[PDB]
């Protein structure tokens, strides 16, 4: 598995804006890196699938390939997830502002965890 390559994939295959598929876009990138995650429909629920695949919860400054899973925010009940490219979080779009993909999230500050493969 190459977490770096997964990140590179995500960066390459973004949409110009959110299309409501953060989870699939990140899953497909992780598949590009070498890992097929067990599917689940909502981003908020991807934690267990990540630990099962060998990821562990990471705390601290982000590294390339790191995967964030964020709990729901107002008007976004499914949560969000993204992969870090070394300088930006990448979901179904390239996130200019940070890991929170929008103001509903920055305002509510829902819980989040970061996952890393070894």
């Amino acid at each position: 598995y190459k977490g770096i390559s997964a990140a590179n994939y995500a960066a390459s295959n973004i949409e110009p804006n959110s299309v409501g598929r953060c989870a699939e876009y990140v899953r497909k990138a992780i598949e590009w890196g070498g890992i097929s995650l067990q599917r689940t429909r909502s981003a908020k629920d991807y934690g267990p699938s990540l630990l099962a695949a060998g990821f562990h919860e990471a705390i601290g400054s982000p590294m390339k390939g790191d995967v964030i899973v964020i709990q729901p925010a107002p008007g976004h009940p499914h949560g969000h997830m993204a992969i870090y490219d070394g300088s930006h979080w990448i979901s179904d779009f390239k996130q200019l502002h940070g890991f929170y993909p929008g103001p509903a999230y920055r305002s509510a500050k829902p819980a989040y965890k970061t996952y890393r493969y070894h």
Binding site: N13, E15, P16, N17, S18, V19, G20, R21, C22, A23, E24, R27, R39, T40, R41, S42, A43, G75, H76, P77, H78, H80, P101, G102
Partner: protein, 122 residues
């Protein structure tokens, strides 16, 4: 040539274009299936804020088994509420996702004007 047929044809086309590098709402072929004002408003909202509730507007999920879904599209007979047809659609062989497709007849074709999920409003 029924509302049911439009719903299946649309979703068959839509899930097939999952592998395309262009999100299907940007392909003009979507206008075969979705009413013109509906296509315009969706494109507009996607560009400004992304889709409502932060899930794909048409599938109501953030992720899915493309293969399973394409092989397991089920539609029930349309219900008519006035001149609006309401078609239930289920996706997948396991724990199906259910949506409700609203269509109107413009000329001789049924086109989608709205799609809703089955989640509680809260």
């Amino acid at each position: 040539n029924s509302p049911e047929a439009a719903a299946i044809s649309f979703y068959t086309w839509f899930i097939q274009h999952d592998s395309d590098q262009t999100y299907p709402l940007s392909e003009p072929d979507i206008e075969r299936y979705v009413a013109t004002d509906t296509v315009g408003r969706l494109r507009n909202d996607y560009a400004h804020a992304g889709p409502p509730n932060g899930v794909d507007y048409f599938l109501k999920v953030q992720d899915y088994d493309s293969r399973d879904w394409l092989a397991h599209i089920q539609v029930q007979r349309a219900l008519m509420l006035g001149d609006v047809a309401v078609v239930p659609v289920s996706f997948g062989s396991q724990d199906p996702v259910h949506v409700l497709v609203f269509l109107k007849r413009v000329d001789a074709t049924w086109k989608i004007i709205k799609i809703d999920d089955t989640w509680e409003y809260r």
